[PDB]
Amino acid sequence: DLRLHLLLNTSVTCNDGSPAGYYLKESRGSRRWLLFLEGGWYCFNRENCDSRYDTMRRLMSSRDWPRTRTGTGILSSQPEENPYWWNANMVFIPYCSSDVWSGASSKSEKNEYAFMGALIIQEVVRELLGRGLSGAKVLLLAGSSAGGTGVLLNVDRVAEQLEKLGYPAIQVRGLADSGWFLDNKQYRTEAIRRGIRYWNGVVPERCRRQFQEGEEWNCFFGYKVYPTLRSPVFVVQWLFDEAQLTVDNVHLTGQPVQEGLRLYIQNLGRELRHTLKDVPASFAPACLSHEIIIRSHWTDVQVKGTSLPRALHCWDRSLHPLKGCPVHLVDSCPWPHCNPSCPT
Template structure:
């Protein structure tokens, strides 16, 4: 009996020591972040001292020990404190890997996507992260740029190294950053958050969206206003094509139902949402598709920037590139499938909730928009620019939703009705839902060109695979040029043959 009492006493004391260690570590972390902020104020004198250098984004390490990259290095993010009540949280793009081959290729060709070693301590923000007036919509906001080094669409949560020898901890990284923003960077209950995700990062937002809202609600931040902007992250469910995978040119892995099932298993993905509950765990990869991901969250304030013929969607669907051995019949079959995808994307996006959702949907074959100079983005839709369309949506008070309102689907605040919006004078009305309704890839004359005008090089992973046809096939199809009319001609032939 005395031994048992002694043993319990020892356990109790160890528990006390462990608790004190955690309290000390947290307090130490807070003081360390305060010291970093002080250093930033001293070094960032561009506003106060009249310098021309815009404020830099500063590197921060995540506080959770489990938030690590593929190689085990501590995950990181960049942060700029503008002393604002509005936040831009940008989740980076970068595709994925899931097995020993794809992860080895990724590590060799794109090592920055698997590690945080030797990462720059400061960086200049670009696109929506630019900290100067050229970024007219967001430049005064606090900026957070979450580095993508987990290769798992920010969904993985493996306990240790996976069987392929790397860690997949993307979800842990995402939520560690959100926790740090509350604990160390003074995110407030009356603040507004703009989650912006490009490609893989956008998919990560969509699939984790319910859990993100729940995280804020559980931590007492249910009144925080939240909006989501997706940049070429709206993928549609199309795997019915019987084309073989194109394996001649890594690093992009061939994606099929089987490979997604394998990836989600190796990443140890657990989708906690209405969508996740709709599928067996080995089929939860269906939640990467926009329409599926938003089940139960149809009132989330969402703006979708999307190329209707997104080239990553085409590669994922095994429609691009055109193999060099493809005959004219095969090319027309592929083109017909590509046209079907464009139509499906238009239908899905235009069906989003009219009150809370906006979009800028281009009839182009491209990928990524917000990473560059989006303000001067050259493509317009019905004479309206991306910036003016996005600005209109940002100013639409009907799209304002708190975390709790998104979770419950109930809007407690008094809003102007859509009837009121539509009854305003013509000078006051702006449009935040714009799409190209032409029916073939590159139908907008302002789409980026399909060939590199300086090198004329052909790459199997770029759009020129559409029209750089072998002379014999081009002659058979009646296509003799590489301009936009060639794409139109090819599309018309595909529809005519109804393949």
């Protein structure tokens, strides 16, 4: 189990003004630290955020959080479940800012909600330095869904923070799971643009300088922000991601898929594969699914005979090509479940 700690700086808050926090399990014999960002969509105006507060309140408030949480998948401490990093120090950061981890705005007389995701990450890192992070050799910032996009938006800021604080020896890296989306045409971007204004959202500096004022929404799309980043980032993305298909208005019912939808789905997979061609650390199976790294059976899927925990181990070796230890693993077959190892 990982144990809850509420932030000592109580000005860094969830949406409703309650303190943000993190869950921690220390591993005294390890200099590896894994910090995982939870996902869970977002909200982008007063009415939409009010609705989320009625029925998704744990994603907006710490008042009802439990004292402990069980680590699963990459957060498990058992080697059978986690062949990659089972002995690491484990941190789960709850998503309670509804801002894709981008916000820097407090609750006040003018703002019904606080959007502080970018500041929550920085404050967690600062408070962990007194609990052993100061001795780390590697800090892996990981995340799923909105948390995977959050990795892309925040990994270089964590690296800059540790450099300015006097810890240049800590190697900061990212692992973005299910957060690499396409700004494509629907089968049958404005919400992000609205959200950034509502949240006072912030994006990485080099990407901001390319796209300039009013166009910062572009930096939420992986294929546009990734080339601007300096820290090493491993990208995990299903080729037929269920969240991508939902926003594209695609719903599979079991009836025969006709030609127009067949071509739409095939072109989506081809476009995703194209955006990953120049991403040297990546894992992209031809499956219809969403999220993987904190699932207990994350060990089961393979691309070209290599599992995700193996690919991450090969990535670690590469950061010290490798015979029999690949790091770039993208399926080429063109339809969901053409890979036999896809989740059932």
